[PDB]
Design a protein around this nucleic acid. Structure first.
Ligand SMILES: [Mg+2]
Ligand SMILES: [Mg+2]
Ligand SMILES: [Mg+2]
Ligand SMILES: [Mg+2]
Ligand SMILES: [Mg+2]
Ligand SMILES: [Mg+2]
Ligand SMILES: [Mg+2]
Ligand SMILES: [Mg+2]
Ligand SMILES: [Mg+2]
Ligand SMILES: [Mg+2]
Ligand SMILES: [Mg+2]
Ligand SMILES: [Mg+2]
Ligand SMILES: [Mg+2]
Ligand SMILES: [Mg+2]
Ligand SMILES: [Mg+2]
Ligand SMILES: [Mg+2]
Ligand SMILES: [Mg+2]
Ligand SMILES: [Mg+2]
Ligand SMILES: [Mg+2]
Ligand SMILES: [Mg+2]
Ligand SMILES: [Mg+2]
Ligand SMILES: [Mg+2]
Ligand SMILES: [Mg+2]
Ligand SMILES: [Mg+2]
Ligand SMILES: [Mg+2]
Ligand SMILES: [Mg+2]
Ligand SMILES: [Mg+2]
Ligand SMILES: [Mg+2]
Ligand SMILES: [Mg+2]
Ligand SMILES: [Mg+2]
Ligand SMILES: [Mg+2]
Ligand SMILES: [Mg+2]
Ligand SMILES: [Mg+2]
Ligand SMILES: [Mg+2]
Ligand SMILES: [Mg+2]
Ligand SMILES: [Mg+2]
Ligand SMILES: [Mg+2]
Ligand SMILES: [Mg+2]
Ligand SMILES: [Mg+2]
Ligand SMILES: [Mg+2]
Ligand SMILES: [Mg+2]
Ligand SMILES: [Mg+2]
Ligand SMILES: [Mg+2]
Ligand SMILES: [Mg+2]
Ligand SMILES: [Mg+2]
Ligand SMILES: [Mg+2]
Ligand SMILES: [Mg+2]
Ligand SMILES: [Mg+2]
Ligand SMILES: [Mg+2]
Ligand SMILES: [Mg+2]
Ligand SMILES: [Mg+2]
Ligand SMILES: [Mg+2]
Ligand SMILES: [Mg+2]
Ligand SMILES: [Mg+2]
Ligand SMILES: [Mg+2]
Ligand SMILES: [Mg+2]
Ligand SMILES: [Mg+2]
Ligand SMILES: [Mg+2]
Ligand SMILES: [Mg+2]
Ligand SMILES: [Mg+2]
Ligand SMILES: [Mg+2]
Ligand SMILES: [Mg+2]
Ligand SMILES: [Mg+2]
Ligand SMILES: [Mg+2]
Ligand SMILES: [Mg+2]
Ligand SMILES: [Mg+2]
Ligand SMILES: [Mg+2]
Ligand SMILES: [Mg+2]
Ligand SMILES: [Mg+2]
Ligand SMILES: [Mg+2]
Ligand SMILES: [Mg+2]
Ligand SMILES: [Mg+2]
Ligand SMILES: [Mg+2]
Ligand SMILES: [Mg+2]
Ligand SMILES: [Mg+2]
Ligand SMILES: [Mg+2]
Ligand SMILES: [Mg+2]
Ligand SMILES: [Mg+2]
Ligand SMILES: [Mg+2]
Ligand SMILES: [Mg+2]
Ligand SMILES: [Mg+2]
Ligand SMILES: [Mg+2]
Ligand SMILES: [Mg+2]
Ligand SMILES: [Mg+2]
Ligand SMILES: [Mg+2]
Ligand SMILES: [Mg+2]
Ligand SMILES: [Mg+2]
Ligand SMILES: [Mg+2]
Ligand SMILES: [Mg+2]
Ligand SMILES: [Mg+2]
Ligand SMILES: [Mg+2]
Ligand SMILES: [Mg+2]
Ligand SMILES: [Mg+2]
Ligand SMILES: [Mg+2]
Ligand SMILES: [Mg+2]
Ligand SMILES: [Mg+2]
Ligand SMILES: [Mg+2]
Ligand SMILES: [Mg+2]
Ligand SMILES: [Mg+2]
Ligand SMILES: [Mg+2]
Ligand SMILES: [Mg+2]
Ligand SMILES: [Mg+2]
Ligand SMILES: [Mg+2]
Ligand SMILES: [Mg+2]
Ligand SMILES: [Mg+2]
Ligand SMILES: [Mg+2]
Ligand SMILES: [Mg+2]
Ligand SMILES: [Mg+2]
Ligand SMILES: [Mg+2]
Ligand SMILES: [Mg+2]
Ligand SMILES: [Mg+2]
Ligand SMILES: [Mg+2]
Ligand SMILES: [Mg+2]
Ligand SMILES: [Mg+2]
Ligand SMILES: [Mg+2]
Ligand SMILES: [Mg+2]
Ligand SMILES: [Mg+2]
Ligand SMILES: [Mg+2]
Ligand SMILES: [Mg+2]
Ligand SMILES: [Mg+2]
Ligand SMILES: [Mg+2]
Ligand SMILES: [Mg+2]
Ligand SMILES: [Mg+2]
Ligand SMILES: [Mg+2]
Ligand SMILES: [Mg+2]
Ligand SMILES: [Mg+2]
Ligand SMILES: [Mg+2]
Ligand SMILES: [Mg+2]
Ligand SMILES: [Mg+2]
Ligand SMILES: [Mg+2]
Ligand SMILES: [Mg+2]
Ligand SMILES: [Mg+2]
Ligand SMILES: [Mg+2]
Ligand SMILES: [Mg+2]
Ligand SMILES: [Mg+2]
Ligand SMILES: [Mg+2]
Ligand SMILES: [Mg+2]
Ligand SMILES: [Mg+2]
Ligand SMILES: [Mg+2]
Ligand SMILES: [Mg+2]
Ligand SMILES: [Mg+2]
Ligand SMILES: [Mg+2]
Ligand SMILES: [Mg+2]
Ligand SMILES: [Mg+2]
Ligand SMILES: [Mg+2]
Ligand SMILES: [Mg+2]
Ligand SMILES: [Mg+2]
Ligand SMILES: [Mg+2]
Ligand SMILES: [Mg+2]
Ligand SMILES: [Mg+2]
Ligand SMILES: [Mg+2]
Ligand SMILES: [Mg+2]
Ligand SMILES: [Mg+2]
Ligand SMILES: [Mg+2]
Ligand SMILES: [Mg+2]
Ligand SMILES: [Mg+2]
Ligand SMILES: [Mg+2]
Ligand SMILES: [Mg+2]
Ligand SMILES: [Mg+2]
Ligand SMILES: [Mg+2]
Ligand SMILES: [Mg+2]
Ligand SMILES: [Mg+2]
Ligand SMILES: [Mg+2]
Ligand SMILES: [Mg+2]
Ligand SMILES: [Mg+2]
Ligand SMILES: [Mg+2]
Ligand SMILES: [Mg+2]
Ligand SMILES: [Mg+2]
Ligand SMILES: [Mg+2]
Ligand SMILES: [Mg+2]
Ligand SMILES: [Mg+2]
Ligand SMILES: [Mg+2]
Ligand SMILES: [Mg+2]
Ligand SMILES: [Mg+2]
Ligand SMILES: [Mg+2]
Ligand SMILES: [Mg+2]
Ligand SMILES: [Mg+2]
Ligand SMILES: [Mg+2]
Ligand SMILES: [Mg+2]
Ligand SMILES: [Mg+2]
Ligand SMILES: [Mg+2]
Ligand SMILES: [Mg+2]
Ligand SMILES: [Mg+2]
Ligand SMILES: [Mg+2]
Ligand SMILES: [Mg+2]
Ligand SMILES: [Mg+2]
Ligand SMILES: [Mg+2]
Ligand SMILES: [Mg+2]
Ligand SMILES: [Mg+2]
Ligand SMILES: [Mg+2]
Ligand SMILES: [Mg+2]
Ligand SMILES: [Mg+2]
Ligand SMILES: [Mg+2]
Ligand SMILES: [Mg+2]
Ligand SMILES: [Mg+2]
Ligand SMILES: [Mg+2]
Ligand SMILES: [Mg+2]
Ligand SMILES: [Mg+2]
Ligand SMILES: [Mg+2]
Ligand SMILES: [Mg+2]
Ligand SMILES: [Mg+2]
Ligand SMILES: [Mg+2]
Ligand SMILES: [Mg+2]
Ligand SMILES: [Mg+2]
Ligand SMILES: [Mg+2]
Ligand SMILES: [Mg+2]
Ligand SMILES: [Mg+2]
Ligand SMILES: [Mg+2]
Ligand SMILES: [Mg+2]
Ligand SMILES: [Mg+2]
Ligand SMILES: [Mg+2]
Ligand SMILES: [Mg+2]
Ligand SMILES: [Mg+2]
Ligand SMILES: [Mg+2]
Ligand SMILES: [Mg+2]
Ligand SMILES: [Mg+2]
Ligand SMILES: [Mg+2]
Ligand SMILES: [Mg+2]
Ligand SMILES: [Mg+2]
Ligand SMILES: [Mg+2]
Ligand SMILES: [Mg+2]
Ligand SMILES: [Mg+2]
Ligand SMILES: [Mg+2]
Ligand SMILES: [Mg+2]
Ligand SMILES: [Mg+2]
Ligand SMILES: [Mg+2]
Ligand SMILES: [Mg+2]
Ligand SMILES: [Mg+2]
Ligand SMILES: [Mg+2]
Ligand SMILES: [Mg+2]
Ligand SMILES: [Mg+2]
Ligand SMILES: [Mg+2]
Ligand SMILES: [Mg+2]
Ligand SMILES: [Mg+2]
Ligand SMILES: [Mg+2]
Ligand SMILES: [Mg+2]
Ligand SMILES: [Mg+2]
Ligand SMILES: [Mg+2]
Ligand SMILES: [Mg+2]
Ligand SMILES: [Mg+2]
Ligand SMILES: [Mg+2]
Ligand SMILES: [Mg+2]
Ligand SMILES: [Mg+2]
Ligand SMILES: [Mg+2]
Ligand SMILES: [Mg+2]
Ligand SMILES: [Mg+2]
Ligand SMILES: [Mg+2]
Ligand SMILES: [Mg+2]
Ligand SMILES: [Mg+2]
Ligand SMILES: [Mg+2]
Ligand SMILES: [Mg+2]
Ligand SMILES: [Mg+2]
Ligand SMILES: [Mg+2]
Ligand SMILES: [Mg+2]
Ligand SMILES: [Mg+2]
Ligand SMILES: [Mg+2]
Ligand SMILES: [Mg+2]
Ligand SMILES: [Mg+2]
Ligand SMILES: [Mg+2]
Ligand SMILES: [Mg+2]
Ligand SMILES: [Mg+2]
Ligand SMILES: [Mg+2]
Ligand SMILES: [Mg+2]
Ligand SMILES: [Mg+2]
Ligand SMILES: [Mg+2]
Lengths: 48, 275
RNA sequence: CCGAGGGUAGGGCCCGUGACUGGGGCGAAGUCGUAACAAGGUAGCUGUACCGGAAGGUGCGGCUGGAU
RNA sequence: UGGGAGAGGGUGGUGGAAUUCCCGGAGUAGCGGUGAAAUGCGCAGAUACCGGGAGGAACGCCGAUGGCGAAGGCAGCCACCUGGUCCACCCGUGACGCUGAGGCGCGAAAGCGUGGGGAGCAAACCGGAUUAGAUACCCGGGUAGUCCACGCCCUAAACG
RNA sequence: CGAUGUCGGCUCGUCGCAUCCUGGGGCUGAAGAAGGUCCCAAGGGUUGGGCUGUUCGCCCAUUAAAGCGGCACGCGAGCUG
RNA sequence: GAAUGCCGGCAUGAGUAACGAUAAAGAGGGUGAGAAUCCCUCUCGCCGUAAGCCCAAGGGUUCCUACGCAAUGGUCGUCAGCGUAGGGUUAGGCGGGACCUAAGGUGAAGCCGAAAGGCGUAGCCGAAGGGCAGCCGGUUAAUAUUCCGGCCCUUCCCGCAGGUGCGAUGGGGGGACGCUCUAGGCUAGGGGGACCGGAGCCAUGGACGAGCCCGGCCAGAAGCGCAGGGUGGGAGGUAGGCAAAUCCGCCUCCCAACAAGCUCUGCGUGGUGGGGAAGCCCGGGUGACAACCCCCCGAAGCCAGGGAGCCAAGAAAAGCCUCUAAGCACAACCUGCGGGAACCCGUACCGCAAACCGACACAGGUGGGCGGGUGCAAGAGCACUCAGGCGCGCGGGAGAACCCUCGCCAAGGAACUCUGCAAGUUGGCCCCGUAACUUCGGGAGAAGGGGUGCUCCCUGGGGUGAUGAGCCCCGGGGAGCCGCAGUGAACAGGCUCUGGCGACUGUUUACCAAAAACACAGCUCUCUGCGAACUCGUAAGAGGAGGUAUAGGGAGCGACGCUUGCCCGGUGCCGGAAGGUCAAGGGGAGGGGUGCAAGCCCCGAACCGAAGCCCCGGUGAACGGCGGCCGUAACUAUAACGGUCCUAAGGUAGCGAAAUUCCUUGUCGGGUAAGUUCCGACCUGCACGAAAAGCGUAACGACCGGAGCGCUGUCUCGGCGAGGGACCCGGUGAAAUUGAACUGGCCGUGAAGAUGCGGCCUACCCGUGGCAGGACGAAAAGACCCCGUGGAGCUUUACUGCAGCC
RNA sequence: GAGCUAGCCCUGGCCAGGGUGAAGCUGGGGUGAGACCCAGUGGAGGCCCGAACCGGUGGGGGAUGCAAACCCCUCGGAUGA
């Protein structure tokens, strides 16, 4: 049956992407946290 | 004269349609239409704020002239009478001798070919618009402004009309479609005659489908819900109201008056509606 | 081939009968009231409608085949 | 051909009196109702009186033992559309007539459907009386309906 | 109660005997035939169907008879539901 | 040493289950250390509205080649989507961008919010919508509308020539639109040809033939031809299209008008460039100087912005054209021609799947296009089959029980069971024929029945031609032939009578309920006069609605028919300028603290002072409610009638043992041999009843009852057969569970059901296939039940607040 | 977090084939004119049968699954809410 993950590159970048995160106070707190933790990727990889 | 159907389906048995006899032109003036942006009953937050709306036929908005005092003295020929999906009245295409074209709501008895005009000096004839103070006491009227130059607000629905009952200084007394008696400023414009398509109210939708075509989604009873949802929700099996009949939001819905008490227009309303 | 008739199926008419039910006629030695005949104690009768334990009442309109 | 009378019919308009209600004024202790009462209304200002307004229905006098229509039935006044009918002339047609099973149309009131309208009145209904009782008569309320449009219903002491 | 799945049916039995039938007896208000009542006896047998979830029960047609109980009201790591 | 402890390791179950669709395999040859599994050939099977082909997502080198086989691959592996390495993706014209706008998002101005931030006309961003110039063929191991070849085209720049009042982000036109049905002419695609081209074949009894088999086209500028789309022309007036306007709009006049003309598209032809089969020869050569023609069928595609009908009335903006404004009129623009210029990103490969989503090379899920042929009435259905692709990554035997899926069955025919559950029956088309009832549509495919293949003869209309032959389509009438059987296979309703509920088509608990539940047209109450009421938001702002009482919100009821009674004392709501009560505030009689004092400070009565409540009234399709006792009639029985207690008032019409009835399987009637169910009745209705509607109702229902016919392995009552497993051999090899075990019966005992205690009985050691009675077997710290001053959802005239309103 | 699911908004796309045969229109009949009747034409509909497609009715299988909802048979809708 139809499962939950239905990959869509525009949807991914537009929802979790760097510019989405920077636009919002919560989103910037995510980036700060992920940079402080030392994450190698701040934002989901998506191919464009 | 509403049109009936033979019962060749369970729904055609009751369905009735308007006869569309007054309609002379089946395409709108391209320069007088603009897209009607459908809301689904959602506001700018994206929230439903009027339930059960959406999914109706696509519609173009016809720009309607609700001023008229806009072109005083300039006669216009009634070019056509057309269907407007956005209102119950029919609409009439005016060709001003100006070359300007506009729509008005079609009055009862308006004939294509006839001439209409707006202004204090207009003849008292169906389709003409005048300030209320120059319209003879007793004549029935429509598309009435509520305040001068703010545009026609009153008696616009199919078949409706207001009647001039008398004059009192700067104001004139109207009987509104609702039977409410009200002072309206004399400089307010109105159009003589009643709104056309009076048979509108005799239409029988006939089937659920027809409501959907109109953008009305199914309405679900409070009694059909659960207590999280509604005052009437819950109960084992069917249940009576079990409290004063209430809205989804808890206010009472049988008789509870809701017009604001200290409203400034109360000074202008002579007698509340009938029936 | 046709064919008495037999068989399958489906209709039409008529008769008898049926738990129960509707009113009707007769009976009369009962109960309730007394609607009509007198102006019958609300003049009567009437088509219709609604109503009442009952006869009946009332509305609307009609007739005189109504006493004074 | 020339005239006449008429609430004959249909449609659109329009007038006045009265009832009710609403507004303003003025005023006070009752009003209403009946055989007599009571319910009811009224000091939260009724009734009676004056001015203003809204609205529906019916048309006083004329009016008659009257007129018109096939019957049902038709009554303020104006206009338009339209039927029947009588008279005089004795001009035209030349028996073209009478009736009429079926058919078709019309058909008071009540009633029905859809929509309007709703003042007064008033089935049902509620209350007061009356009465032995009173699901009545009388009284105070009161919804259909009574009115308009369209469609049905097709009855009658539809009687001379 | 860190679980012993609860009615009824089906399947499969097995046991008790306070015995429904068949076998053996005594008494009889046992003439015979047929019964009644008690005693011995558990080897075998103890039907099909209508109703109802039913167990039970009532009914139809038979029968030598159409027994009653126990086995976690036997049997859901066997089925049904 | 225990915490169903934590981490790790390793056991048991066990050589056990399983190895992932029952589309299927066999042999020969090759390679190699090794071969059922890799390559090649032949044979066999399976898909073929796909299990083939192309595109978009998504994936991201999985593509190609060489070399490999430890691991990955459910076995094997020499193979591979695996390891290593090298190679491979070529664009002005395809897609997206340097164009447009849609929802929406952002947001100059502007508005709002403690902060963060929320809005917001314009503008901007935003596509799979609009717009825009490339087709055919060849080539690589691997890309190709991209490279090449042929023939076409677009924009930009510059120049030349001719032409013109040129010029725009401004005005206007246009772009520009639905659903259903549909005409004409075409193309795609397909069938046939006794005609054209072709390697060859004559078998096994016959055929050297009008034989078999194969193929018989593709792209193409200008021109031309056919079919269509689009558009009237001239003048005069002009006050409107936020300036201007010669444009557009409006008015008038004059020619024109199912015409033409002008224009644009489609199809045909077209210089030219290509392609080109079977067969047997080793992807390539030959076939071949290939031929390339006629007829028929024919779209849902094209002409297209075509036509008609209908109501629910069907985007925008740019490109484009026209108009003018500043300007500028040596410019500028337009037309033609010529030369130059023409950027960025994508392009491999998988793509209904072993490369995407499902932890797996997972029987699941995934949008668009092509999807041949024959026959079956049609069709994308069904059967077979083309092209193309596959045999599903463990096999080999055996021929038990039992399981699955399947086939048949004597006699019976629902006796099965909760229930005909399941499975039979029926089954397409043509014809005949068809009841109650009905809202006149229907019910209806009612029911029921007849026909159905093939051969010959005669004949009727239509399409394409030409009016004819041919082809193709739709018929009719005779006479015959064969079989058990002619929709001969495959796909394809069992039916009837009668109740309950819901009017109906719809909707629902994704993953235990599809229903009688929700919705629904429709009915009624009620609110709302517009800056509406109501909803979301602190607000601004939005929805409502660019709507206006024939409208919008809320509530109940639920097509339709016939109806919807009585009670307004309580609660609700509505009305009531009286009166009672009533907070802050006003008021300040009187009293107090303090000071030598003027003074300062405090308390405080009458009185005035809202909504709310009280109080008066209205109101039921507002919340709701709708009795009891005694007595009475020519036999009994009953009680029309009378009396009395109580109430706000005492259940009307209709219905009733009911989706409601406890007693209950009520009683009676029907059906049955027999009927706790069913249907019809009765009425002492435990405990119906009128919009939480009452009683009915044609049609409808994968709803729930009852009956009958047909037919059956449901059953009496079981038998046999098939395949996939189970079993055996080779390969690979889990799991929950497990205190340890050397783990028998009975009668007892024992914390009350003992392999483990006592007594007795029985018992050589170890497995394999089977069965489930026990191990109070496994699983899940019982979900019932209680307990905890544990939690959470819900309610209200519980308490206390808060929003909101007054 | 609405790449699952629910609703709405914008823009596209899809629905083989067959059946029934509403209004309207034409002709005929009918009438004073009408209503209306008959025939042909027509092609309506939350119409009918049935694929794709959307579902998920009953049974069977599956139950350490092919699968944390699947498989077979059967069955609902299929121009419309
Ligand atoms: Mg998706
Ligand atoms: Mg992904
Ligand atoms: Mg994307
Ligand atoms: Mg995308
Ligand atoms: Mg997206
Ligand atoms: Mg982003
Ligand atoms: Mg990481
Ligand atoms: Mg790093
Ligand atoms: Mg992140
Ligand atoms: Mg009309
Ligand atoms: Mg009709
Ligand atoms: Mg109708
Ligand atoms: Mg019709
Ligand atoms: Mg119907
Ligand atoms: Mg119409
Ligand atoms: Mg009209
Ligand atoms: Mg249109
Ligand atoms: Mg526009
Ligand atoms: Mg708009
Ligand atoms: Mg809008
Ligand atoms: Mg927004
Ligand atoms: Mg938002
Ligand atoms: Mg709402
Ligand atoms: Mg809504
Ligand atoms: Mg309109
Ligand atoms: Mg209308
Ligand atoms: Mg209606
Ligand atoms: Mg609409
Ligand atoms: Mg609605
Ligand atoms: Mg509802
Ligand atoms: Mg519920
Ligand atoms: Mg919630
Ligand atoms: Mg609540
Ligand atoms: Mg409730
Ligand atoms: Mg309840
Ligand atoms: Mg409930
Ligand atoms: Mg209940
Ligand atoms: Mg409920
Ligand atoms: Mg309920
Ligand atoms: Mg319910
Ligand atoms: Mg209630
Ligand atoms: Mg309740
Ligand atoms: Mg209650
Ligand atoms: Mg409120
Ligand atoms: Mg105002
Ligand atoms: Mg015989
Ligand atoms: Mg009398
Ligand atoms: Mg008397
Ligand atoms: Mg009398
Ligand atoms: Mg009565
Ligand atoms: Mg009585
Ligand atoms: Mg009475
Ligand atoms: Mg009379
Ligand atoms: Mg008189
Ligand atoms: Mg007279
Ligand atoms: Mg003469
Ligand atoms: Mg009459
Ligand atoms: Mg009447
Ligand atoms: Mg009234
Ligand atoms: Mg009495
Ligand atoms: Mg009534
Ligand atoms: Mg009525
Ligand atoms: Mg326990
Ligand atoms: Mg345990
Ligand atoms: Mg356990
Ligand atoms: Mg004897
Ligand atoms: Mg003895
Ligand atoms: Mg024995
Ligand atoms: Mg024994
Ligand atoms: Mg029994
Ligand atoms: Mg019993
Ligand atoms: Mg009994
Ligand atoms: Mg015997
Ligand atoms: Mg026992
Ligand atoms: Mg017991
Ligand atoms: Mg017991
Ligand atoms: Mg037991
Ligand atoms: Mg037992
Ligand atoms: Mg048991
Ligand atoms: Mg079980
Ligand atoms: Mg059991
Ligand atoms: Mg067990
Ligand atoms: Mg067991
Ligand atoms: Mg067990
Ligand atoms: Mg069972
Ligand atoms: Mg159960
Ligand atoms: Mg310890
Ligand atoms: Mg453990
Ligand atoms: Mg453990
Ligand atoms: Mg542990
Ligand atoms: Mg651990
Ligand atoms: Mg070990
Ligand atoms: Mg084992
Ligand atoms: Mg091998
Ligand atoms: Mg090997
Ligand atoms: Mg090979
Ligand atoms: Mg095949
Ligand atoms: Mg095929
Ligand atoms: Mg991946
Ligand atoms: Mg490649
Ligand atoms: Mg590679
Ligand atoms: Mg390997
Ligand atoms: Mg290996
Ligand atoms: Mg190896
Ligand atoms: Mg491996
Ligand atoms: Mg694997
Ligand atoms: Mg090797
Ligand atoms: Mg591989
Ligand atoms: Mg290489
Ligand atoms: Mg190129
Ligand atoms: Mg550029
Ligand atoms: Mg853009
Ligand atoms: Mg685009
Ligand atoms: Mg392009
Ligand atoms: Mg080209
Ligand atoms: Mg390549
Ligand atoms: Mg448009
Ligand atoms: Mg469009
Ligand atoms: Mg449609
Ligand atoms: Mg055509
Ligand atoms: Mg072509
Ligand atoms: Mg063909
Ligand atoms: Mg030979
Ligand atoms: Mg042509
Ligand atoms: Mg001008
Ligand atoms: Mg070749
Ligand atoms: Mg050659
Ligand atoms: Mg040659
Ligand atoms: Mg089509
Ligand atoms: Mg409409
Ligand atoms: Mg726009
Ligand atoms: Mg200048
Ligand atoms: Mg030019
Ligand atoms: Mg660039
Ligand atoms: Mg490529
Ligand atoms: Mg698939
Ligand atoms: Mg996942
Ligand atoms: Mg595999
Ligand atoms: Mg797969
Ligand atoms: Mg093809
Ligand atoms: Mg077939
Ligand atoms: Mg077929
Ligand atoms: Mg099929
Ligand atoms: Mg083939
Ligand atoms: Mg295989
Ligand atoms: Mg074996
Ligand atoms: Mg199979
Ligand atoms: Mg048999
Ligand atoms: Mg039978
Ligand atoms: Mg039989
Ligand atoms: Mg049954
Ligand atoms: Mg079949
Ligand atoms: Mg019948
Ligand atoms: Mg009929
Ligand atoms: Mg029907
Ligand atoms: Mg048949
Ligand atoms: Mg039937
Ligand atoms: Mg044959
Ligand atoms: Mg056969
Ligand atoms: Mg098949
Ligand atoms: Mg069928
Ligand atoms: Mg059956
Ligand atoms: Mg029946
Ligand atoms: Mg019902
Ligand atoms: Mg239903
Ligand atoms: Mg339902
Ligand atoms: Mg109904
Ligand atoms: Mg309904
Ligand atoms: Mg329904
Ligand atoms: Mg449907
Ligand atoms: Mg659930
Ligand atoms: Mg469910
Ligand atoms: Mg769940
Ligand atoms: Mg669930
Ligand atoms: Mg289920
Ligand atoms: Mg369900
Ligand atoms: Mg269903
Ligand atoms: Mg529901
Ligand atoms: Mg419902
Ligand atoms: Mg109703
Ligand atoms: Mg709020
Ligand atoms: Mg706003
Ligand atoms: Mg708004
Ligand atoms: Mg708006
Ligand atoms: Mg509105
Ligand atoms: Mg409902
Ligand atoms: Mg009826
Ligand atoms: Mg009350
Ligand atoms: Mg009250
Ligand atoms: Mg009272
Ligand atoms: Mg209460
Ligand atoms: Mg009040
Ligand atoms: Mg006073
Ligand atoms: Mg003082
Ligand atoms: Mg002192
Ligand atoms: Mg007060
Ligand atoms: Mg009422
Ligand atoms: Mg009460
Ligand atoms: Mg109530
Ligand atoms: Mg007596
Ligand atoms: Mg009762
Ligand atoms: Mg009553
Ligand atoms: Mg009963
Ligand atoms: Mg009942
Ligand atoms: Mg009950
Ligand atoms: Mg009880
Ligand atoms: Mg009972
Ligand atoms: Mg019982
Ligand atoms: Mg019984
Ligand atoms: Mg039963
Ligand atoms: Mg039952
Ligand atoms: Mg009884
Ligand atoms: Mg309710
Ligand atoms: Mg109910
Ligand atoms: Mg009720
Ligand atoms: Mg009923
Ligand atoms: Mg249904
Ligand atoms: Mg159903
Ligand atoms: Mg069997
Ligand atoms: Mg066999
Ligand atoms: Mg076998
Ligand atoms: Mg086998
Ligand atoms: Mg076998
Ligand atoms: Mg062996
Ligand atoms: Mg040991
Ligand atoms: Mg023990
Ligand atoms: Mg023991
Ligand atoms: Mg032992
Ligand atoms: Mg020991
Ligand atoms: Mg011991
Ligand atoms: Mg021992
Ligand atoms: Mg022993
Ligand atoms: Mg066991
Ligand atoms: Mg044990
Ligand atoms: Mg056990
Ligand atoms: Mg056990
Ligand atoms: Mg468990
Ligand atoms: Mg638990
Ligand atoms: Mg725990
Ligand atoms: Mg526990
Ligand atoms: Mg517990
Ligand atoms: Mg639970
Ligand atoms: Mg307990
Ligand atoms: Mg406590
Ligand atoms: Mg405690
Ligand atoms: Mg709590
Ligand atoms: Mg669209
Ligand atoms: Mg679309
Ligand atoms: Mg379809
Ligand atoms: Mg036809
Ligand atoms: Mg037409
Ligand atoms: Mg349909
Ligand atoms: Mg259909
Ligand atoms: Mg259908
Ligand atoms: Mg299923
Ligand atoms: Mg089945
Ligand atoms: Mg089976
Ligand atoms: Mg499962
Ligand atoms: Mg399946
Ligand atoms: Mg299946
Ligand atoms: Mg089917
Ligand atoms: Mg269907
Ligand atoms: Mg279809
Ligand atoms: Mg449908
Ligand atoms: Mg639609």
């Amino acid at each position: 049956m139809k499962r939950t993950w239905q990959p869509n590159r525009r949807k991914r970048a537009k929802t979790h992407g760097f510019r989405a995160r920077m636009r919002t106070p919560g989103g910037r707190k995510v980036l700060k946290r992920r940079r402080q933790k030392g994450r190698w990727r701040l934002t989901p990889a998506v191919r464009k | 004269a509403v049109k009936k159907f033979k019962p060749y389906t369970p729904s055609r048995r009751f369905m009735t349609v308007a006869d569309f006899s007054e309609i002379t032109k089946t395409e709108p003036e391209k320069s007088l239409v603009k897209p009607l942006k459908k809301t689904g009953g959602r506001n700018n937050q994206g929230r439903i704020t009027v339930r059960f709306r959406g999914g109706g036929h696509k519609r173009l908005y016809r720009i309607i002239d609700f001023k008229r005092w806009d072109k005083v003295g300039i006669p216009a020929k009634v070019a056509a009478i057309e269907y407007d999906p956005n209102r119950s009245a029919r609409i009439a295409l005016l060709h001003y001798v100006d070359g300007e074209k506009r729509y008005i709501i079609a009055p009862d008895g308006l004939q294509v070919g006839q001439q209409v005009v707006a202004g204090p000096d207009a003849p008292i004839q169906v389709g003409n618009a005048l300030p209320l103070r120059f319209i003879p006491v007793g004549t029935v009227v429509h598309a009435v402004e509520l305040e001068p130059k703010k545009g026609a607000k009153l008696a616009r629905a199919a078949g409706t009309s207001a009647q001039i009952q008398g004059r009192e200084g700067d104001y004139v007394i109207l009987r509104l479609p609702s039977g409410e008696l009200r002072k309206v400023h004399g400089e307010c414009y109105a159009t003589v005659g009643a709104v056309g398509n009076a048979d509108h109210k005799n239409i029988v939708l006939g089937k659920a489908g027809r409501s959907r075509w109109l953008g009305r989604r199914p309405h679900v009873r409070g009694a059909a819900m659960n207590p999280v949802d509604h005052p009437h929700g819950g109960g084992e099996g069917r249940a009576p109201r079990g409290r004063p009949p209430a809205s989804p939001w808890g206010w009472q819905t049988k008789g509870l008056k809701t017009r604001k008490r200290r409203k400034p227009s109360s000074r202008f309303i002579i007698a509340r509606r009938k029936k």
